């Protein structure tokens, strides 16, 4: 299939009250497996499958690298504040890096930054240069290119990342490949109760889902709204969809749920005769 490895990091001037200024988190197929913050200063396991499939030297090597990342991004905050001629305020440096193992067999690589939530730089592994998204990123480009990082980064994205991703997918194939059935509730609210109807799929895994409305057994996209996919504390997902109906029309509607955990689409009504 397709597997993704993602490392996201944020360095912030204002996190704030009792919260770490620097945080790094790792993702395999969208699932959190590692964490680092500037208070603990240690890389830590977040899933059962990564722990007991890795020894102490793995976490020691990860700790050292992210401690290095932390210090660079501390400096980055100072460098960019000065370059932008900013006096105080709330500022952030964000990084996203990793790789994709596409269905085709082909490999995608990413190494990119944002300053104050706007694209700053991105590595173009095709041309072996760092692309400047803004004029303030031109001195960055010149320093980074002179630093000779392209070679090692191309190598990391096309090979080391891919190899690491294969390892992790193998350690967590059972958890990543599991199926969790959602518990579904159809509800309604306002004039006698049938203005806004809601359908909620609680606790599904994996993330892909299709939640739609049927009125007298026919698909209804009209007056429908989705809240998207939202997470639960246990790694499972939640989604809520609404449709605006005429008062007294509650019994006409059904919520259709298409998910991997369901052999056939689930059809649900607001209570029984509501």
């Amino acid at each position: 299939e397709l597997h993704t490895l993602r490392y996201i990091r944020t360095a912030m001037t204002d996190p704030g009250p009792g919260l770490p200024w620097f945080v790094d988190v790792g993702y395999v197929d969208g699932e959190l497996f590692m964490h680092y913050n500037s208070t603990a200063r240690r890389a830590v396991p977040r899933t059962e499958w990564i722990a007991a499939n890795t020894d102490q030297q793995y976490w020691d090597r990860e700790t050292q690298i992210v401690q290095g990342s932390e210090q660079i991004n501390r400096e980055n905050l100072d460098i960019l504040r000065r370059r932008y001629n900013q006096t105080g305020g709330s500022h952030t440096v964000q990084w996203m890096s990793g790789c994709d193992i596409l269905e085709d067999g082909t490999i995608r690589g990413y190494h990119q930054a944002a300053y104050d939530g706007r694209d700053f730089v991105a590595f173009d592994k095709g041309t072996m240069t760092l692309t400047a998204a803004v004029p303030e990123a031109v001195p960055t480009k010149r320093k980074w290119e002179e630093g000779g990082y392209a070679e090692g980064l191309k190598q990391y994205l096309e090979e080391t990342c891919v190899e690491w991703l294969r390892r992790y997918v193998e350690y967590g194939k059972a958890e990543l490949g599991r199926r969790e059935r959602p518990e579904v509730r159809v509800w309604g609210k306002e004039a006698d109760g049938i203005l806004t109807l809601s359908c909620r799929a609680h606790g599904f895994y994996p993330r892909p889902i299709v939640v739609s409305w049927l009125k007298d057994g026919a698909v209804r996209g009209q007056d429908a709204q989705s809240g998207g996919i939202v997470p639960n504390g246990d790694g499972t997902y939640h989604t809520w969809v609404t449709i605006d109906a005429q008062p007294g029309d509650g019994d006409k509607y059904q919520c259709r749920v298409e998910h991997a955990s369901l052999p056939q689409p689930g059809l649900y009504s607001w209570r029984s005769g509501g």
Partner: peptide, 11 residues
Amino acid sequence: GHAEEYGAETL
């Protein structure tokens, strides 16, 4: 794993 070269985060 993270790339060993944290220097590639130099801005």
